[PDB]
Amino acid sequence: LPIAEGRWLDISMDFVTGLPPTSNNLNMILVVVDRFSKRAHFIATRKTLDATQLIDLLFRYIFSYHGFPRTITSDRDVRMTADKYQELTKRLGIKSTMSSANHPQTDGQSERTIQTLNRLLRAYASTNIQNWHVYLPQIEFVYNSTPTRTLGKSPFEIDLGYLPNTPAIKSDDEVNARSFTAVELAKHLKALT
DNA sequence: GAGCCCGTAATACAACAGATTTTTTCTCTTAGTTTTAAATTTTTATATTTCGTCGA
Secondary structure: OOOOOOOOOEEEEEEOOOOOOOOOOOOOOEEEEOOOOOOOEEEOOOOOOOOOOOOHHHHHHHHHOOOOOOEEEOOOOOOOOOHHHHHHHHHOOOEOOOOOOOOHHHHHHHHHHHHHHHHHHHHHOOOOOOOOOOHHHHHHHHHHHOOOOOOOOOHHHHHHOOOOOOOOOOOOOOHHHOOOOHHHHHHHHHHHO
16 A cells, blocks of 8 residues: 555554453454554453444544544454444545455455554553553553564654653664753754654 | 674564354263162082191
8 A cells, every 4th residue: 555644644543352351441442553653552442342333433632632644544344334424524635445345355454453453462461351451551661662674763762853761872873862852852853853 | 805803773574453152073071860789697419729737
C-alpha cells in the first residue's frame, strides 16, 4: 500500500479475540498502528462495550486526540462495516478502505504488530486471570521504545524525536536528546521523515 | 587460490490471519449397590497335629 504520509495520515487497525476475561473484557485488542512512525497503540476494550455506536468512537477519539488521521485500512468486521461508521468517517474526511472478505493481509502491519504484541503479552501474562490490565500500557511503552528492523530507529523516537526518560544516548550525536526549543523542530523532524 | 578471526550486516522464513465446544469411543479413579458366603453353639463317632504335661 502507499508508502507514508505526514505522521500517520495513513493508519491501520484490526481486531483479534480469544483473550481471557478479567472484567468481562474478552476483546481487549483494538490495536491502532501509526503506519508512518509505527507507533502502534493498542487500548483495552471488550465486545460488549460498543458496536461503533456509543463508546467505541470515544476512545477512538482519545486515541485520535493526538492527531486525526486521513486514511484508515481495516477489515470487513461488523464493527466497521456499519452505516454509522462509514458516514461519520466520510464526514471526518477519512477513508475506510476495508478488506476483501477474509483477506487480513490488507491490515498486515497491524496484524504484524499483533504478532509482536502476542509474544510480549505472553511474556507479561503470568497473572493471566487475576490482575493484568496494567500490562497493556507497559507493553505499549516497551514495544514503542524498542528499535525495529526495517527502519533502524525505535518507533517512539521516529515521531516524537527524542527517546523516553533515562537517556541512553547512542554514539551518533546529542540529537536524540532534542528536548529543547521548538522553533527548529520542523527542519530536523522533516529530515527524520 | 586457501584458510582464519571478527565485526557488521544482509537474509529467507515464519507468525498475525475469529475462537471455541462437540463427536465417538475408550481407559483409570472412586463412590454406591447386590448376592452370598461367612463369624460363635450341639454333636456324634471316627484320626492326625500340635501343644501341654508328667515320669524315671
